[PDB]
Amino acid sequence: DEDETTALVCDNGSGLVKAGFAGDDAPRAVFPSIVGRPRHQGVMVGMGQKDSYVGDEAQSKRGILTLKYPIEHGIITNWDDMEKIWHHTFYNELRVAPEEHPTLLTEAPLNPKANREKMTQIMFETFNVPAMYVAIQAVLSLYASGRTTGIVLDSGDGVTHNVPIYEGYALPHAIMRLDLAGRDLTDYLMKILTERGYSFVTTAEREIVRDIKEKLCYVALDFENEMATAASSSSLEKSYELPDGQVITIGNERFRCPETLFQPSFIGMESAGIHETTYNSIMKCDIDIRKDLYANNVMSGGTTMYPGIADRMQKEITALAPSTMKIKIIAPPERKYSVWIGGSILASLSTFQQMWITKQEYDEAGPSIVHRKCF
């Protein structure tokens, strides 16, 4: 609180907002992106509740609330709800006066121009920021990495991409999309557990299943052989206590759930699994740069956090590639916050501080400015 200034790095996630100050090593505020007020709301004797805050309160308030994601699949679809999320971010989580900070916002891949313009309009008109930037989330991640060359497999919450990069450039024609990512894997685990006679269907039960997924699932060494071991499997049958206190047993569901990344037909997806899309992406590049891609396969995103994933990707890529090809899979430790960190590096870039968009630019060429000939 003086001269200088930082850069409000707000990564608008499909399920979680990550926000903080440029220059910090990780976001200081992480809260669910949802909207929820009592679904039954039966009055009582007073009030003192906040209608649709969701954020952190919701979670801990599981069972009372309803949820909505105004950013459900990564694109913002409800501007009144999004204004509530940004107000919460600035005033309740970070506890800042937004008019004192240049703010860098992230946007999903393929975000419409008109959507970026509405984001810009709200920042300047509603929150009175002195400036702002919009950055592409994949791009920020790439930034955080620091690798000019290599092929990234980025699997997050709602989408997975394979992005080959040569000298810093995402050759746009190589990238392929997959709908599936963690949101789909949590829904599939709810369904397969419901196969055993359990019942996980409510909003609260979804949260419970997301926790089972993140704590007990793993990727097999070989799907077929893991299924065969399931028979005499005395390991798989882990126990998990529900908040009600009942204890369920989870066995082959531990590896059947994430097997979907390699076999999208488990959820009905025709798409090619992540090892096939990696190969298909490398084959859309020049033959010449393929050796550099094969030796620099970088994993990113929350859904690449499973133990065993790098070794499995090494095995599968080795099976598809030429016999003399050197293959290397890199996974950065704390991948998931790779998107926020790239934003932090960019926003905290004094040297490129002219890329931030300003109140004068917005007034001159409206918000589009932050879209036409920059970010």
Site residues, a second copy (CB under 8 A): 38-46, 49, 61-64, 66, 75, 110, 112, 139, 142-143, 148, 166-173, 177, 194-197, 201-205, 207-208, 241-247, 267-268, 270, 282-283, 285-291, 294, 321-325, 345-346
Query: CA separation (Å) from 323 to 175, 279, 298?
Result: 25, 14, 21
- Closest distance of CB 194 from a second copy, Å: 7
Judged by beta carbon, residue 208 or residue 309, the one nearer a second copy is: 208
Please report the beta strands in the chain, taking only residues with DSSP state E, as ranges in sequence order. 8-12, 16-21, 29-32, 103-107, 131-136, 150-155, 160-166, 169-170, 176-178, 238-241, 247-250, 297-300, 329-330, 357-358
Applying the rule CB under 6 A, the residues between 44 and 103 that interact with ligand ADP are none
332 near ligand ADP, rule: CB under 6 A: no
How far is 317 from 328, CA to CA, in rounded Å? 9
Give min distance, CB of 217 to ligand ADP, in A: 7
Binding test (CB under 6 A) with ligand ADP, winner from 182, 273, 343, 367: 182
Q: Which span sits near ligand ADP by CB under 6 A: 150-158, 195-203, 241-249, 291-299?
A: 150-158
- Burial of residue 48 (CB within 10 Å: 0-12, 13-18, 19+) is exposed
> How many residues does this entry show for the chain?
375
Residue 14 in contact with ligand ADP, rule: CB under 6 A:
yes
Interface with ligand ADP includes 162 (CB under 6 A)?
A: no
Contact 338, 301 (CB under 8 A): yes
Q: Of the ranges 224-232, 269-277, 300-308, 323-331, which one interacts with ligand ADP (CB under 6 A)?
A: 300-308
Residue 91, binding choice from ligand ADP, a second copy, none, Cβ under 5 to 8 Å by partner class: none
State which residue, 36 or 102, has the beta carbon closest to a second copy.
36
CA atoms within 13 A on the CB side of 231: 4
Q: Name the pairing type of β-strands 297-300 and 150-155.
A: parallel
Separation between Cα atoms, residue 189 and residue 324, nearest integer Å: 39
The residues pairing with 240 across neighbouring beta strands, listed in sequence order, are 248
Contact 67, 54 (CB under 8 A): yes
Residue number, 183 or 206, with CB nearest to ligand ADP: 183
| 302 lies in the binding site for ligand ADP (CB under 6 A) | yes
Q: Which residues pair with 10 in a beta bridge?
A: 19, 105
Among 120, 336, 346, 370, binds ligand ADP (CB under 6 A): 336
Judged by CB under 6 A, which of 72, 83, 179, 214 binds ligand ADP? 214
Q: How far is the CB of 179 from a second copy (least distance, A)?
A: 8
Which stretches of the chain bind ligand ADP, using CB under 6 A? Answer: 13-15, 156-159, 181-183, 210, 214, 301-303, 305-306, 336, 339
